[PDB]
A paper describes a structure:
We also characterize the putative dehydrogenase Cj0485 through crystallography, enzymology, and multiple biological assays to confirm its function as a fucose dehydrogenase, which we have named FucX. Several aldose sugars in both d- and l-configurations were screened as substrates and Cj0485 displayed substantial activity on l-fucose and d-arabinose and with low levels of activity on l-galactose. The Cj0485 monomer adopts a Rossmann-like fold comprising a central seven-stranded twisted β-sheet sandwiched between two trios of parallel α-helices. The holo-enzyme’s asymmetric unit contained four monomers that were arranged as tetramers with identical D2 symmetry to the crystallographic tetramer observed in the apo-complex. PISA31 analysis predicts this recurring tetramer to be a stable conformation, supporting the likelihood that the tetramer is the biologically relevant assembly of the enzyme.
To provide insight into the substrate specificity of Cj0485, we solved X-ray crystal structures of this enzyme alone and in complex with NADP+. The apo-enzyme crystallized in the space group C2221 with two monomers in the asymmetric unit and the crystallographic lattice generates a tetramer with D2 symmetry. A Cj0485 monomer from the apo-structure superimposes on an apo-FabG monomer with a root-mean-square-deviation (RMSD) of 0.9 Å (over 246 matched Cα atoms) revealing the similarity of the folds. Furthermore, the tetramer of Cj0485 superimposes on the tetramer of apo-FabG with an RMSD of 0.99 Å (over 1003 matched Cα atoms) indicating adoption of the same tetrameric organization.
Numbering used by the authors:
A (entry chain A): 1 to 259
B (entry chain B): 1 to 260
């Protein structure tokens, strides 16, 4: 299947690790040019991305600094001639519960998880409109389902679903598509380290994983990336405003399901 | 992108024309083997599918005949060694409004549009489970949004969304994925024929298409097929229970949206 993304530039925030890095590698392996906006880039990942895409670039960026985003997005467009797509992905679940988190720390969490989806999209939009490209917002099941001790992350993820619908409305006339992917449980190196905090890591994994109908196992980075890159590509040219769940059935299947 | 469907068999009901045929062609272009279950097969379409896949087959079938379905699904599995996927797609919008349609005629509509989704899936399931394959139900925006003068079609399409969720639950343990695609307005030769019946076909098209946010134009068969075949493939290996809308924004974006 020819995704028709050869030499198309995609900026990926938080693209140096985890889901974002999986999207970056697949974008490059399909002929696209990934541009990584992250605070840091592991040297081994820089090496692999360079092997996959000779025009790939890493831009060291503090996504809480709006002026740095404006400067760096413009440098990307100058270097490459334009931008076809943006994947907003930087952020983490910081488990900030309302009952012991101040409003000020909610806002600090939004600085880390929410506001740069807006700033990045604002600055990329003139270029993405010119190329009739794509915006993809990586969100989370938690913005749909809740979780119970993570008010700041849950509301940021839902806000980004709202941006997805709003920007889909705003730019459909421009033939710019705007979609989101809501992963549920995705195995990443960071998740693996978290599981290793537990007295029995395999037991904790199985405790979480048994609630996933399809295979009682976490989604893979590859599975998220496959749907992300297909959705960004022109082969998904009438898909907009969608919140996509490649999640093993986590959101939609009967909560009581078991083996 | 390597979809990893080389030599995998997919049965497509209503696969001789329109959306089903687009799925069949793309399945074959990507290395899969499409098997078409329909009442008839255009000669030119048979020629094109054979050009794409020497093992493609057309089986003439009355999808209201459950025993013929049983016998022909078995024939496919014997011939090819198994079945990886099923696309349930046969049916039409017959615009049967409740106020002037008897319950008997509702049921006759279900014979045309609904019951064979169950029968086909029942008979394919042992084979698809063995191959840890995929079931894809083609439904319609109308099962979600309603329309207003098509009770039989709307309820059949919604019933099939129910089957999608139920079968996803039933066979997740078997690593069988079950999903649906809900197209909105898809340009097909059948749609073009329907439009040509109006005194002003262009204006009728534009009246409908102006309500589609992405481009004020119908979805293409290729757009439906691309999402269908990707979803069927092992690359969507954690996608199940989904009702997918490649639809230009028809279901989800503000109904008031316009280009002003």
């Amino acid at each position: 299947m020819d995704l028709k993304i050869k030499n198309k530039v995609c900026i990926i925030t938080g693209g140096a690790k985890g889901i974002g890095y999986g999207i970056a590698k697949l974008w490059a392996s399909e002929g696209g040019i990934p541009v990584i906006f992250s605070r840091s880039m592991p040297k081994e990942h820089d090496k692999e991305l360079k092997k996959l895409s000779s025009e790939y670039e890493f831009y060291e960026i503090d996504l809480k600094n709006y002026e740095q985003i404006e400067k760096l997005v413009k440098k990307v467009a100058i270097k490459h001639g334009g931008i076809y797509a943006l994947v907003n992905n930087a952020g983490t679940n910081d488990n900030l519960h309302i009952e012991n988190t101040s409003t000020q720390d909610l806002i600090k969490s939004y600085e880390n998880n929410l506001f740069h989806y807006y700033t990045m999209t604002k600055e990329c939009l003139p270029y993405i409109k010119k190329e009739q490209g794509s915006i993809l917002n990586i969100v989370s099941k938690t913005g749909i389902t809740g979780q119970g001790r993570t008010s700041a992350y849950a509301s940021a993820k839902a806000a980004q679903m709202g941006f997805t619908r709003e920007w889909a409305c705003a730019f459909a006339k421009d033939n710019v598509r705007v979609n989101a992917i809501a992963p549920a449980e995705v195995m990443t190196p960071l998740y693996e380290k978290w599981l290793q905090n537990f007295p029995n890591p395999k037991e904790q994994y199985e405790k979480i994983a048994k609630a996933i109908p399809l295979g009682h196992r976490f989604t893979t980075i590859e599975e998220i990336a496959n749907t992300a890159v297909f959705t960004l590509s022109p082969l998904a040219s009438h898909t907009t405003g969608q919140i996509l769940m490649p999640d093993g059935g986590y959101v939609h299947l009967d909560r009581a399901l078991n083996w």
